[model samples]
Every structure is written in C-alpha cells, then in structure tokens.
Target: LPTWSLRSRLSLSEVLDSGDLMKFAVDKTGCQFLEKAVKGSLTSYQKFQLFEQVIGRKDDFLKLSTNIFGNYLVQSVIGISLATNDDGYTKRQEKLKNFISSQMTDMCLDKFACRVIQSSLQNMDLSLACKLVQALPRDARLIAICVDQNANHVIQKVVAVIPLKNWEFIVDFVATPEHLRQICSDKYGCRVVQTIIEKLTADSMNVDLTSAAQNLRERALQRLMTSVTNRCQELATNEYANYIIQHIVSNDDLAVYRECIIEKCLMRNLLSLSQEKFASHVVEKAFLHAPLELLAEMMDEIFDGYIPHPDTGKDALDIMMFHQFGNYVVQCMLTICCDAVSGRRQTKEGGYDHAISFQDWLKKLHSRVTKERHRLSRFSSGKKMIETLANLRS
Candidate 1:
C-alpha cells in the first residue's frame, strides 16, 4: 500500500493525543482540526475512530474538556457540522448527544455546556436533544437556573425543529409544575415561570396528551404541577418572576390561550401555597405587569368568582378594580380567567383541539406586543396596561 506521509500520520496522532486541548481552543484551533478530519477526503477509519473517542469522552474530559467544549472551538465545530453532516452521520450524531448527555448531570453551568446545548439543538435529533436536557443537573438550583439563560437559545431552536409527534418529550419534561417552574425560572424567570404554572393548571383541566399523539400535554402538566408544589421557595423571591409577569401582561397581553393557562395556574397555585399574602402579591404584580385588559378581566373574576357570584352587583366590579390593592386586584381576576381549557379542549365524546393554536398565537402576540408596547410605553417604568393590550381585541 502506498502509505500516507509520516508527517501527516504524526499530525493525526498528535491531534488525537491533544483532544482535550482542542476542546479549549475556542479561537478555532480545536474545531479546525476536527473540521479537517471530518471534511478531509482521505480520513481513514482509524482516524475517524480516534475522533469519535475524543467526542465520546468530551463530557467526562474533566477540567480540560469542559473548558475546551465551552469555548469557541466547540461552537465552531457545531457551526460547520450543522451545515454539513459528517461522515458517520448517525453514529457521530448519536455519539455527540450521548457525550453531552453524559456530561449534563455532572457539568456545571458554563459556556461549553451552552455550546454543546446549542450544538445538540441545531441537529434534527429530537431524542438526543431531549436526553441532553434531562441529563442536565437539577441539584444545583440557582446554578441550574442561571445555566438556563444560555440553554434557552438551543431549547427554543430545538422546540422549533421538533415535529408535533415529538413534542411529547418537551411536554413530559415540562409537565411537572415544579420542573416547569425551574425551567421557566432558568429560561424565563420566576414570574414568567409562574405564568406558565398557571397555564399548566388551566391546561390540565382539558388537555389530553395521550390523544394528542404528538405533544406531551399530560406529562408536561404533571411535571408542571409537581415542580410548582416542590419549588415554592425558588419562586417566591425570584427576581425574574416580575419580569416574566410583566412580559406576559405587557407583551403577550395574556393572549387568550396563554391567559387561560397562566391565570388558572396562578389561582391553583394560590390554593396550594395557602399563603394568601404572598400569592396575592404575585397576582397583584401580574396585574401591574400587564394593565388594561388584564385589570378588567381580573376585576370581573373577583366580583364573579369570589364576591357576589351570579347575584353580585356590577358595582362590585368597579370597586374591585379601584380597590386599595393597587393594580394587583385586577391582575388576579385576569389570571383567574385562565384554565387548562385555553391551552387545550375537551368534549363529552373525547375529542378537541390541542394547544398548538394557542401556543402559536401567544408566541406571535408576545413578539408583537413586546415590541409595540415597548415603544408605546417608552417613558413608563414598565409600560401601561391600556396601551399594551390596545392591539388586542376583546
């Protein structure tokens, strides 16, 4: 056989030995080497095997691998590889996910894990994508929450790519209110997470994940409920909570679907926490978070649900709206309006719509509202309720 040059083979061996070093070369050195091997026309099976070994153990590569993976090199590899599937497409993809997942529980929140998460997300592999997430450490609450900021890009990207058939994984993962709360806190913030909690409770009323066949509505709800019950402490003092609440109110305008879920969840959670003062505070903040439409709805709920029932005077509504509770009174009413039904549907014969419509609408509304409300309330501390929900129709 006309063998390759000694220099080339020696370079390959040298690269293989320095795999940990490559992981650290965020400046592109490590990624460049991987690229050469992946794109190189002459890469042999032995070389590929060596490469896999490096990729496989990356999650367990100790401090060196952790640093290298988080830096620019790993991201570069992902960028290039995403553009072109490598030689061992399936095997390599699986290996990469396995490696990342393996490291998830052990790795702390760092740039490398973030990069790996981004890498996993760009791929179309839903199974691996989920595994990577599940494998992430949940023991370190605060750190885990912070890590989510970096994880959000990949999470949303992956969510975007997944088929409805595979949405179950996400739903199941987020099913626990507590888990959902953590995810929300991590990805969104405590208040936003609370909105999700409310949404989950509301969704539980009607959503049937089993039939949905694609989305894991039931599983996600289950987890969401559980997470909420378990992580009360985290939610109470969450700095991100108010921000998230503001976002839903001011930006999402609590799009009917989202409103139904978030509101229902908060109310349900209110019952669970048994802490009227704190729960009321959260509800009040939610009202102030988004204003106009929210206040009206909240006022309606207080009078209708809590105060006068079917016989209550309409004057109570006005009183509730202007009460000393500040804007929170109205916010609670709006949240009260949400239920699982908004995110899903149920029928006597067991057939109805899934949350897709609501989710899509909310996402769209969120984007538009966030941008428009920002401009309209440019001078306001957090924006006003009327202008925020102005674009929304009754």
Candidate 2:
C-alpha cells in the first residue's frame, strides 16, 4: 500500500480500477475523489470506465443519486456522457439514459435524485428527453408529476427543450380543462400551467393573424383560452391559480379572454372582491384594464352597501380609504377615476356629464375627507388618500 495524495493521478488510477469506482461513488470522501477524477484529464476510455461502473450498476445509481457528494459524481458522469463522436460515449450515454428512464419515477420523487434527472434531461439528447416524458404514466399521474416539487422542473425542462410539435402532445395531454383547473391550484403545478399557456401563446405567435381570420386555428389555443375563461372566477380567487389568471389578463394575445375575465368574473364579483387581500390585487389588475362601465361599477361598489364604513357606519368611501389593504383598492379606484375624468375632460363634448359625475364623486370623497380628518388624517394611508384627492382638485 503506497500513500498517494487525493489529487494524485496514482490515487485516481486506483479509484478507476475494479470496485474502487463504486466504493468512491458510495461514500462522501470517495465520491469527491471520483468527482475530481471526472473533472481532471482522462481518456474517453477512462471516463467511460467510471461511467460504466457508477451509472452502470443498479445499486450504485440508486444509492449515489441521493448521496450528497455522490450525486455530483452522477451529474459529472452525465455531463461527460455528452461526447457524441465516440462509440464509448454513445454506449455511456445509452446506459445512463436507460438507467434514468428506468428509474425516473423514483428519481423524480427523490429530492436529490430529481435534480440529477432534471440535469440529465436538460443535458441529454432531445430524443432522450422526449422518451423520458413519454415514459411517465399518462393523465392525472403525469399532471401529478408536473406539479411535484422535484418533478415539476423536469416537466418545465421538457417544455423548454422540445419543439412545439413534440409539446403539442404534452399541451393537449395536460391542458384538459379539468387538468388545467386542478394544476393551477398547485404550488408547482401552477407554474406548469403557466408554461403550457406560454407555449400555446408562443405556438400561436408563429401563425399569421390572416390565418386566424381565415378560421385556421390551433385547437389548443382555443382550448387554453376557453379553459381560462370558463374558470376565470374560480381561478381568480385561488392563491396559485390567481397568478395564471393575472398572466392571462395581462397578456395582450389573450385580449378576448381579458374581456371574458372582466365581464364574466370581475364584474360579477366586484363588491366582495375589492376588500379581499389576495383577490383585491387581482381585482385591481382587472381594474387597470377595465373599461369605463366596469370602472363605474367598481366606483359604485366602494360606495355600495356591501362594504360598510369602518368608523362612521355609513356608506362613506373614506372608510376603506383608511384601511391597510382596503386603501389600495381605494387607490386603484381613485387613480382610475382621476384618469377617466382627465380623459373625458380633454376628449368628450362639453365634458358636462363627465364633470358632474366626477364632481359628485369628488364631493362625496371630500365630505368624508372633512368628516374623517380628525380620526384618519393622522394616518399615512389617510394622508395618501387626501393627497390623491388634492391632486385631482388641482
């Protein structure tokens, strides 16, 4: 037995010999030794030898895919497996791909192994990536994996790397209205839904608008739109689902769907949602893009009996103006009101009707401003509301 530095080629040679590679892969110290070996110069033959011994064995692949240091060794083998010009590289790639595809279900479920699988798909060939996606069981099981914390990355990678032609199957497979609704509520699955929406949008971008006018359409696009519109209200109220709803409303390609969100969802629930913490933000986003009629409805909601005055117990708009979150809803309403008044004053004929309506709203807000000055004027939110109103008067 000769003493050799861990960095020494002699020590590396020992690790590459026989069972030494597996030994290195099974433990932290030895795995670090193998990691150094992979990073250091080695012949294609030597790299393949270690690839075979480590990724080649069922037991080593299972154990090391989760090992702290050993996981790096597995990743290194994957990175090195990309050599396309050599037979050894091809064999190594095949062996590694087979091992991953065979164990992907378990690998995706394991926290550490999941990254290795994700790295493998990202770094490996497109055919292999498609194969990996195809290998996962279909339907809700597939959707389940898409939303899985570890597995979700793999699904995103698949969408990212594969062509839309390949992804068409995935989008159609995953975008069932039921599936979209279910996944949109998930922590990670919501992201998958966003990706699917993006991919559908991306796919539609390549199409000529003339084609859509000609009624040449992608069914998936219509399906994605219908799914969002059909469930806009339910989605808007969910924490995770709300983001996808926001994305849809903010996206111009889905402008028709935005109207669907407004007419079907926001207008229907205007009064109650304005006071919600999460739903308020969604309502505000909808308001920013809302048409004037809806804005009027929102204004009426603020004054509507649904949201009572916090202090005065009357239908005072200033009540919410002093609230923590309610103030933001008030701010959005005021900002929209101010913009509409300014727009109408500049554009509309005589501006009489607009001015009277604006003046009436302002007078109502001013009366509250006067009444609540003692109680609310001391607060920052109250000051902000007053400042917003003052700017309008100026």
Candidate 3:
C-alpha cells in the first residue's frame, strides 16, 4: 500500500516507526486518525516518539496547536503528555508546556488554539496547570484575553477546573467590584463572571475535589453580590449583562436581593426599567418578588404619572399599556393583584396579600385602562394585559 494510505494491516508501532507524524497531524484526514490514535494507550517510548517527531519542534508545535484539524491532535497529545507516568515524560512535558504556556495569550485569540488551551488545562495535573497559569503575565494579556470572545470560554473552562484555593491568579485581577462589573458587562466576558459565581457554590462543599481555603466561596459570593448590587442599573439595562442582573435579582442564594431589587434598582428606574428591552425582565422579576407593602410603593412608582416625555403626551400607564416590553411589567402587577379566592394562587404559587390594597390599586388601574382599551388592542402586549385585567375585573 502507498505510504499515504493508512493500511489497516500495519501495527501501530510499524506505522509510527516510518511515518512523518507531524505532517499527518496537520493533514485533513490524517488528523482524525492521529487524534484517536494518540488517545489510545501507547507505550511511554511510543508516545515520546510522538513528542520528538511533532511537539519537540517549536514551529511544528504551533502549527499543530493552531491548525484547524491539528488542534484536536494537540489536545489529545496534551492528555498523554500530562498523563504519562513513564521515564522522560516529565522532560517531554516541559518542552510542550513551555511552548504552550508562552503562546497562551497569542493562542487565545485563535478559534482552534482556544480549544487546545482549554483541554491542556482541563486534562493537566492541577499544580502543573496552576503553574502554567501562574507564569502567565498578570498585567498583560491575562485579563485582556479573558475579554476576547473565543478566549472568554477558555477562561470560564479554566475557572471551573481550577480548585478554589489556586484561584487567586484570577480573583486577584477581577477581585474589585468595579472590575467584576466591568468584566461581566462585556458580551463575551459576561459568561466568565457567571462561572466565577457558579464556582462559589461549586466549591462550597468540602468534597475532595473542592479546595475552598480562606473561605473563598462565601467571601467571593459577598464580593460578587456587591458587584451586582452597586451596578444593578447599568448591569440590568445592558444587553449583555442584563441576564447577570436578572440572575442576581432572582437568585434565592442571595436572599438579600429580595429587598435589594426594590430599594436599589426599582426605586428610581421603575417605569423606564420596563421600557428597556433587557431591563424589563429584571423589572418583571423585581415586581413579582417585592414585599406587599414595598410592592405597593413600587406599584405607586408607575401610577404616580411621572412624565417621561411630557411633550409626547404618553403617560406611564398609556405608554406601559401599549409599550412593547412595558406591558409585561403591567401584567405582573395584574397577576400579583389577582386576589386569589382560595388564599393560594394555583398558577402563580403566591398567597394573596390583602393588607396592601393591591386589588383596589388594580381596580383603579383597570378602570383607567378600560377607557383606552380600544387603542390598547392594537399592540399584542396591550391586548394580553387587557385580557388578563378584564378576566380578573369581575
């Protein structure tokens, strides 16, 4: 058979002895075979041959790491490089490590290299991976790559894999509330912030895999909660971080948020919050969760008829009734005002709060909307809220 054709008859060693392995690693079809073969159990010497022929060459290592198909081969080889318990494995590992490490910031920007970088961390020995990140420049592209689109996911993957104790490399950079808010505010980087939050609960347990020394879980949670709390306005209204604010607003883990939303975000931005495409969701969640008395004040914020655009002549009620996202916030008001007859609302799962006079407020709001009902029907959001209000009217 021709050398190019990977004849099935040839033994693994027989093929390895004669082939230009690095060439195949970058080839379209051969990369598939190379990746799977590298993942299979080869002798320590056989694997080392792979390093000698492929990864040992600095130029070839970069080519293999960043190549479209070769990236997976490099990823699979890294597992073997770190997993090998044989002689010369450590010697071989460092060569690959030094090569991969220095190129991290550079590799992070490429689509394919990002995959290799993440797997290298995922499959490496913990301390070794920590060392790899430790040597990375803190002031340079460290946080810079975390902000890039392709690398954002890479940072999240690294964040999840790193034990909480060794997490200072990152926490040291984004530790401040403003920095946390800044990172979470970016579209690509927002996910990285969430992973940091997820890791809080992830390592809170004293399981063997966790390493939350210095009370990393609780401490970081406090810091993160503060991050969202202070910047709730910009965070909620931002197209990218609106979800982060929503997460904080409704996250029962941060029960402080139950009151936090009412006083901080809703106190001032009440009506306009619903007008925004993104902040509207935060508004909906905030209104639904407020204490009955506090909710009434929140309910009053919209009803007081504050002029948003006085010249336009559209009051809060008129604008909200027909406004695209605002109508849903109104529906939330209608649903909460739903004085459940049985004292338990089956669909919504809340007991009626008769003391707040929500039903009377609903009646008053309903009476006004009733007059504009015809024009309100033109918008679907208006129609949905109108239908809900009418059904609850009687």
Candidate 4:
C-alpha cells in the first residue's frame, strides 16, 4: 500500500545482472529505470555493463528500439557509447549500423524509432549515417515521407547529418513548384524546408566543398530564393510560410532573396498589407530590417499620405494609429523614423535622402497628431503610439 515513494528503487547492476535486460529493456518500468541509470555519472565499466546488455539481443534489440518505452533506452545506449569508449565500441557501433541500416524503413516510420535513428545519425560516423540515408526509398518516396508525422524528422536528420551534395534529392524535393507551398506551409514540412535553406546557405559559405557539392548547394539555394521571389507576397501572409520569408530577411547571406522579397512584395503592397493580422508583422520586420536604401523606399511607399489635402480626409498615419494590428506596424514605423532624427543608425548614412526629410515630416505629422491627440489617447496601442510621439520631440 506504500506509494511509489518507496519500492521503485532498484540497484543498477541488480537489474543488469538479471540476464533479463532484453525483457527489462522493453518493460515500461525497466526501460525507464535503465535510461536513468545509464545517464547517471557512473564509471565507464558500469556503462559498458549496461551497453552490452542493450545491444546483445539482436532481434529483441530491434523490437526494443521500436517500443514506445524502450526507444528511450536505445537512445541512452547511443548516448553512453558516445560519451565513453568501451571495449569493441567500434565493432559495437558498426554492429548497430549494419542492423539499423537494413531495417531503416521500419525505424523511420515508427514514432519513437525515428528518434533513435536521429540519435545514431548524430552520434555515429558520417559515413555510417549517410549509408542509412542511401538505404531509404527514392526521391518521390522521400518527398512523400517528409510530411509524415514521424518520417519527416528522419528526413531532416538526413539534411542535417548528410553533406549537401550527397542528398541532391532534397534540392529537387523542394524545387518542385507544385508542392512548394504545400511543403512550406505544412506543420512538419516547414521545418524541413527551413533546414534545407539553412544548410544550403551555410554550405555556400565554405570553399572546402568540392566543385560538384558547391554547384548543388548553390543550385538548391538559388532555387529556393527564386521560388520565394515568385511567391513572397502571398507567402508572407501565410501562417507558416511567413516565417520562411521572415527567416530569409533575418539572414545576412541571403541578401539577394531579401532584396527580391522587399522589392516584389513588401514595397508594392505595404499599404494594403499594413492592416493584415499576419503580414502586418512582416511589414514591421521589414520596417526594422530593410537595408538603408530599401528602408527609404519602404518609408516612401507608406508615408506618402502622411497628410490629407482637406478636412474630410484620413491619412495613412491616422488609419494605422487606431487599428488593432496595423497600430503595431505604426509603432515600428514611428520608432525607425524617430531613430532616424532623434538618434541614428549610421551617422554617415546619416538621415535618408527624401523629398521631405525625416525631421521635417515629423514636425508636420506631430502637430497634426497633437491637434486632436485625445482621439489617439483612447486605446492601449494608440496610447503607446502617443507615447512614442510625445517622446519624439524630447
């Protein structure tokens, strides 16, 4: 009748010596027990004790690695092998590689098994892990599996662990226009898309890559950039795809793509998009992130209507100041504009060249805002914008 506060305790070797670890490795309580034990700060010999017991049973290890509870034990075993080299560690990891390579698909599809595969990909030799990728089904199947609730992670492991040129299929997979949006906006697929872009760009930085590998990654990155160029405006408003656009802008290496997104999507659509719940955030990022020349271009695009000709008029500033989402966009605009005059980004780039310069525009705009300032003092976002304006002159 005692609670688990009592009898869950079992000595580590006591369990290992039982000759029933294959059985214990699959049992929920036993698997949990071993994971903790192996990860403990134990002597190398003690880890080796847990290690052989784990890998000794060929068929049982297969099922154990796939079991929901047992998969964790296999991961810990991978961790143990990585941390300390026991006798025959190479032989053991090779043994693991051989068996796992043959049964790759079964592991790739299993929710828990997929993690063990990723662990091996990260822990094993590059050559060994790349073989597992080769063992997987061809390109079409890989694209299909990448959206698998489970298999997609395995594909990302391939991208992460394998060299760029080795898996050119990834480039092809992402390059296909028909499935481009489907992959970019998907729950799991989006992450794979992000991984591919990151790896491609990072690889592009190194001259160490062979000419063949170099061309492949360049082609892959250029393809992604081109696809983004064609679709940035629509994709920026997407719930998931917007992040990809945001990612591109945030990178220093992808200026070409960022320029494409800024010129094609953000500049042309700034006013219409300033009010969007999703794209408005993209606009804010654009406000904060655009390079100086482009920053002036974006500012001109939106602030052209800063003043109205007559009494029966609403300007862009007034329109955004009161909106739910657009108000936030206005905050960034005001912050950047204020930073331009009150302080500076670079004193050399030192204030943008414009038909109406930043400080002059702010004077006319600020007085316009103050004449009926109480109208903006009503709501939380508006009050925030008012604070920004009040801080402007000070």
Give all TM-scores, in the order shown.
0.45, 0.79, 0.82, 0.79
Q: Pairs clashing in candidate 2?
A: none
Root-mean-square deviation (CA) per prediction: 12.4, 5.0, 4.0, 5.0
Best by lDDT: 4
Q: lDDT of all the models against the reference?
A: 0.44, 0.70, 0.71, 0.74
Model 3 misplaced regions, further than 4 Å: 1-11, 39-41, 56-59, 93-95, 175-182, 201-214, 291-293, 305-315, 339-357, 390-394
User: What C-alpha lDDT, on a 0 to 100 scale, does residue 253 get in candidate 1?
Assistant: 29
lDDT of 3 by residue, 365-391 (tens): 778768878887888766876877666
Residue 124, candidate 4: C-alpha displacement in angstroms:
1.0
- Give lDDT for model 1: 0.44
Q: Which order, best to worst by lDDT?
A: 4, 3, 2, 1
lDDT of 2 by residue, 1-394 (tens): 2133334444566666645565557666666666766787888668667667767777788788877667788888777768535766666666677877787777877788878887877788887766666666666677778778888887787767665555566666656777877788889998988886776663455564455432323566776777777877778889888888888777767767777788778874665676666677887787676544555565665666474557766553554566566677766766666765766433132343455565566566667776777776788867776787788778
Error of 2 at 69 (Å): 2.4
Once fitted onto the true fold, the runs of candidate 2 whose alpha carbons sit more than 4 angstroms away are: 1-10, 203-218, 291-313, 316-324, 337-379, 391-394
Candidate 3 C-alpha error for residue 224, in Å: 3.4
Question: Per-residue lDDT for 284 in model 4?
Answer: 86
User: Model 2: what TM-score?
Assistant: 0.79
By TM-score, who's the top model here?
Answer: 3
The sequence of per-residue lDDT tens digits that candidate 1 reaches over residues 112-140 is: 55555655565636676666666544444
Q: Count clashing residue pairs in model 4.
A: 0
